[PDB]
Amino acid sequence: MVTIRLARHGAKKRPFYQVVVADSRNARNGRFIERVGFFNPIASEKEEGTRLDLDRIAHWVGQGATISDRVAALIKEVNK
Template sequence: MGISAWERTRWDADDTGSRSGNVAFRGPNWSVPGVGAIVPTPREASVWRGRGVCEFLSLIFGPACPAFGPIIRRVHVVRIRLQRLGRHNRPFYRINAVDKRTRRDGSAIEQLGWYDPMAKDPAKQLELNEERVKYWISVGAQPSETLRDVLAKRKLVDVAAWEKDREADRKMVEAKKAAAALAGEKKEEKKA
């Protein structure tokens, strides 16, 4: 097959002209003093282009890139929420742990149970893997408002904090209604 473009452009750290502690770039190669040229294979090159230089170098040097310092990892929030299934006028919901940025019916990290609001028997309306729900909450997953109510009734979340939040929500709704009513009265006075 021949020599690839990546292999043809190999060179040593001595020809880089780099100063001590710097990383020099010429063409597709990187050079770190004391290490020599870093020439990615074609497979590594695709990783390099997709993730960025520092993440590529972290593949070689480990979690801390000596040229750029430690890599800051993004933290993704996990939500426990409902995914609607079923048909028209016959809803059925899965309870899933999902990345917060995922759309409502997107892919889930883990299925934790299901909720069938149309079931006649209340005992058959909700099936929940409580062990896994407790695990996800312990690692920082945030339940949606609807599921927080369900989990509080099953005492899987802090009930006192839940009641406090519910009371604050009720007060906020009442304040918005009062403000809307006051704004409506002011509009009527201006018209008259």
């Protein structure tokens, strides 16, 4: 199953997270098709914090890869 999922990225007591498209299948943050964004749970309360390639995701969903509840909710942080 090709899935659009959040990947393990950050520091001790400071998680950051990236989002990638991959068959899973593959292990943790590796061997991915392409990157589409980053979360940053803090994002310093600013509009230049958190990014998501909503148009490349629109070509990778369909008729494409799966997107689950917690990842389909990333659009709510960029709002949008």
